[PDB]
Structures are given as structure tokens and as C-alpha cells.
Design a protein around this ligand. Sequence first.
Ligand code: ADP
Ligand code: MG
Lengths: 266, 16
Amino acid sequence: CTRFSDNYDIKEELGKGAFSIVKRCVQKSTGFEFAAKIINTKKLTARDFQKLEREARICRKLHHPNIVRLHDSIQEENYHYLVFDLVTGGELFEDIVAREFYSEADASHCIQQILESVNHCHQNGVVHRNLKPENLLLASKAKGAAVKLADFGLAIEVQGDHQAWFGFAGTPGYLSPEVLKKEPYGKSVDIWACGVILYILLVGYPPFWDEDQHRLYSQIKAGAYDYPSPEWDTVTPEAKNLINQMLTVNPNKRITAAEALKHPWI
Amino acid sequence: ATLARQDTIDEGGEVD
Ligand SMILES: Nc1ncnc2c1ncn2[C@@H]1O[C@H](COP(=O)(O)OP(=O)(O)O)[C@@H](O)[C@H]1O
Ligand SMILES: [Mg+2]
């Protein structure tokens, strides 16, 4: 193919993760703008290409207002393009650092939307495996803007409650104890990450952190975290309750997305 | 401790 290069004009960088760069682009025939996730494929292995197909496949399957929409998937000689609807408000990540933290009200609304996107994945038999603020995009800069779940690069399929060893993958500070313990795991790992995100929403820094990554993983596995003063003094216990239920070490004892959305604090 | 971006990892190892 030259199907992308022929039909799209690439514009500015929007963002990047570990192995892609996302640029705004414009479709020539329409003048409509999109986000083109670009992956250099020269270096890539058979497994890496199957992962791209998997990404495109699962994104299409999960089409929904709170999930990024895939417009096309195109392989040229040296690059693959996943063309998505453009989400213009930037990463939740940015907005959090811009504000330091969200009020309980706004955190509550934001995590509600995140959990709605996650539950949408789970009730369609998908575990995302890489929930974090970099992978949640905002429809705009306005308060309570819609939240869009992105980056299905690691997403895989699972039946219901089932758990199996789906491999060592995710983003370190968001990884679940069970992934770190190399135990079989399932949808419930995304809920752990939502716990980490909600904690970040409330004080603007993560509950597990260490410069030594070996130590970070220790902390996660042990579920060692607390609510330090003065940051957390004004935060309601009910908010802290919801975090505790998500940051429950044993995944069998962990709150699901469905019953997270029913928490009084939500 | 602060909020900083973090790269994705995938070491596979998935087992049939
Ligand atoms: N649809 C989009 N609209 C706007 N920015 C996007 C969109 N999709 C991704 N991005 C930006 O690109 C970054 C990487 O997207 P991702 O799908 O996460 O690639 P990676 O696998 O490299 O993390 C995101 O963190 C975000 O900043
Ligand atoms: Mg990403």
C-alpha cells in the first residue's frame, strides 16, 4: 500500500507511547481530521505484526462512545497506520498535572466514565491490561469532558471470570500484584489500575512509587500504600473506601467494574 | 513521588 500516504496529509505530533507516535492527519478527499498512530514495522517480528492485527481487531469489536474509534488500518512498506477519530482535549495525564489533582466531585465523575469504558470492555470479554492516565483521552479541556479509552495494543480476550497466564505486560506503576507474581489473571487487573488512577486523581501522585523498580514491584505486590497528611486529610473516607476495594491485592476479593459504578461515592 | 509518564512493556511469556 501507499493507501495512507496517498490519501492522508500528516500534520503535528499529538503524543507517543513506547513503540508508536501519534500524529494529527487530514483526509484529502474530505478535509476531515484524524489521529494517525504510526508504528515503524521494519524492525518488527511476526509476533509484533500479529499484535497490530489484534489491536485493530479488538478496537473495532469494542466500538462505543467512550472507546476511541478506529477509522482504518493500513500497512505501507515501512510503516503501519492506525487511523482513529481525533480526540482534541489531550491525555487525562496532562490535565491532571495541569491541575495537580481533581476535586472529589470531578474525580468521582472522571472515574465513573473510566469505569464505564472498562466495564464496556469486560462485558464484551476484553481485558485492556494497560489502564493509565496516558491512555485515557479527553473530548476537550472543559470540566467533566467525556473520557475516551485508548491504546488497545495489549488488550486480549477472556471469558467472564476466567484467569490464565496472558504474559508479563502493562505499565510498571499500574501493574497488578497478580501479574507481578506471575499468577493467572483476568479482567480484574484493569480494576487495580483504576484504583491507581483514582488515587492519582485525588492527590496528583501515585500510591506505589520508588526509584528502585524492584522495590516498586514489592510495594505493589504487598499492596503497601497509605493516605499521607496533609494531602489526604480533607478527602472523605468514602472515597478512600472505593480506592481500598480496587486496590485489593487478591483479585478474587477485588471489586469489579460493575459494582464499582454502584459505590455510594459514585 | 510524582506523576510521571511511563512506557508500556510486554515481555510476553503467555502460556497455553
Ligand atoms: N485518537 C487520538 N486523538 C488524540 N491523541 C491521541 C489519540 N490516540 C492516541 N493519542 C496520543 O498518542 C499517544 C499514544 O497513543 P497509543 O495508542 O497510546 O500509542 P502507544 O502504544 O505508543 O502508547 C496517547 O498517549 C495520546 O497522547
Ligand atoms: Mg499509550
